């Protein structure tokens, strides 16, 4: 009906611009109609390719990993975006990204190559990589 069509126009205009998670789309539809009208719009967007959280999460992991963030931060950010843990874990497994190698790269960029090895400097390097979201397990072998 009228509410559905008005909300559909609003949704497509938002989504035509750039990728959103389904939850990001909801927040924007709710920013300045029945529950069924919202759901029907959502459903249309998925059917016509304007929403696809699996595509969204794969792209997000790729992008954030290239910017020097590790899994623990990426997972937190995805949760904020309303991506299911299921979608996140599948896309993580699929991306098969060598986090230890990317961490080593961030470290040499900030701290030089060969990496510092003195105890007090190594601790600072570990702190930096952990804050970036790399796992202790990722970090243990950069040396």
Swiss-Prot record:
A Pfam cross-reference name: RecX_HTH2
Keyword Iron: no
Record-level GO cellular component terms: cytoplasm
InterPro entries: RecX_HTH_1st, RecX_HTH_2nd, RecX_HTH_3rd, Regulatory_RecX, WH-like_DNA-bd_sf
Keywords: Cytoplasm, DNA damage, DNA repair, SOS response
Annotated GO biological process: DNA repair; regulation of DNA repair; SOS response
Keyword RNA-binding: no
Subcellular location: Cytoplasm
Superkingdom, natural source: Bacteria
Family affiliation: Belongs to the RecX family.
Record's function text: Modulates RecA activity through direct physical interaction. Can inhibit both RecA recombinase and coprotease activities. May have a regulatory role during the SOS response. Inhibits DNA strand exchange in vitro.
NCBIfam families xrefs: PRK00117.1-1
PANTHER family: REGULATORY PROTEIN RECX FAMILY PROTEIN (PTHR33602:SF1)
Annotated protein name in UniProt: Regulatory protein RecX
The species this protein was found in: Escherichia coli O157:H7
């Amino acid at each position: 009906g009228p509410a559905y069509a008005r909300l559909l126009d609003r949704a497509v205009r938002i989504l035509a611009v750039r990728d959103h998670s389904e939850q990001e789309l909801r927040r924007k539809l709710a920013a300045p109609a029945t529950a069924e009208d919202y759901e029907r719009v959502i459903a249309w967007c998925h059917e016509h390719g304007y929403l696809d959280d699996s595509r969204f999460v794969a792209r997000f992991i790729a992008s954030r990993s290239r910017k020097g963030y590790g899994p623990a931060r990426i997972r937190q950010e995805l949760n904020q975006k309303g991506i299911s843990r299921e979608a996140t874990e599948k896309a993580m497994r699929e991306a098969d990204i060598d986090w230890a190698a990317l961490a080593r790269d961030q470290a040499t960029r900030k701290y030089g190559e060969p990496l510092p090895t003195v105890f007090s400097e190594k601790v600072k390097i570990q702190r930096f990589l952990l804050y970036r979201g790399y796992l202790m397990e990722d970090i243990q072998d950069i040396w």
